[PDB]
Structure formats: structure tokens, C-alpha cells
Amino acid sequence: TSDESMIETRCVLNSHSTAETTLDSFFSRAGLVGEIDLPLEG
Amino acid sequence: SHENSNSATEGSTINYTTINYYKDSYAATAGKQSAAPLKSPSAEACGYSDRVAQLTIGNSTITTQAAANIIVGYGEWP
């Protein structure tokens, strides 16, 4: 509850960016989605 | 101006009319004197509902019914 109704708080300047929790940050990372085998004798 | 202001009621908010034939105010007569704090007033009665809306003191919170059934001792906030 925004830390105010539970404890006494000081002023904190939250220069904490939320840009890394976006979908374009959480999902724009290449991951293995397919492996194709082209063997010689298999 | 001719007597010391050294009775036990100096600094109080009540003017005492008195009789004094001496240098000291404490030598004078008892004289005349020219919600209720003792009735355990509530936070609503004390006008302190802003400080009791949610009782969080320090890193501690108590969850209780506020204002009406919450008593300020002697009508005086600490």
C-alpha cells in the first residue's frame, strides 16, 4: 500500500527505469525454437 | 510592579484578583478566579481524526476501529 500506511518512510527518488520489463525487452531475445537434423545415415 | 510575580499560579491563563500587603505574590490571598479532557475524550472529540485515520507508528501498523472508540489521554496528544 505504497509504503505509507504501514511504516514511516523517507523520501526516495526512484530513478528506476521500467524499460527492461516491457514485452519488447523480455521477449526480444532470440531463443532456440527449432532444431533440424539432416544426418548421413540416420 | 511593586511585588514579585512569584505565586504558584504565575504563567497560568487565569487572572486571580487578590489582596497582598507584602513583597511576594505567594503571600497574597487565595482570591477569586476573576470534549472534557478528564472524561477520556475520543479522537473525534479531540479533533485528532487526521492522526488516527490509520494507526501506523514506525514500521508497525495496528488494524483497529479508529476515531470514535479511540481515546486520547487527558485530551492531550503526545
UniProtKB/TrEMBL annotation, chain A:
Compartment(s) where it occurs, according to its Swiss-Prot or TrEMBL record: Host cytoplasmic vesicle membrane; Host nucleus; Virion
Coiled coil feature spans: none
Superkingdom classification of source: Viruses
Subunit structure: Capsid protein VP1: Interacts with capsid protein VP0, and capsid protein VP3 to form heterotrimeric protomers. Five protomers subsequently associate to form pentamers which serve as building blocks for the capsid. Interacts with capsid protein VP2, capsid protein VP3 and capsid protein VP4 following cleavage of capsid protein VP0. Interacts with RNA-directed RNA polymerase.
UniProt similarity note: Belongs to the picornaviruses polyprotein family.
Function: Protein 3A: Localizes the viral replication complex to the surface of membranous vesicles. It inhibits host cell endoplasmic reticulum-to-Golgi apparatus transport and causes the disassembly of the Golgi complex, possibly through GBF1 interaction. This would result in depletion of MHC, trail receptors and IFN receptors at the host cell surface. Protease 2A: Cysteine protease that cleaves viral polyprotein and specific host proteins.
Protein name (record): Genome polyprotein
Organism of this sequence: Human enterovirus 71 (EV71)
Automatic annotation (TrEMBL), chain B:
Top-level division of the source organism's lineage: Viruses
Localization per Swiss-Prot or TrEMBL: Host cytoplasm; Virion
Family: Belongs to the picornaviruses polyprotein family.
Purpose: Component of immature procapsids, which is cleaved into capsid proteins VP4 and VP2 after maturation. Allows the capsid to remain inactive before the maturation step.
Subunit structure: Interacts with capsid protein VP1 and capsid protein VP3 to form heterotrimeric protomers.
Protein name, as recorded: Genome polyprotein
Species name: Human enterovirus 71 (EV71)
Organism placement in taxonomy: Viruses, Riboviria, Orthornavirae, Pisuviricota, Pisoniviricetes
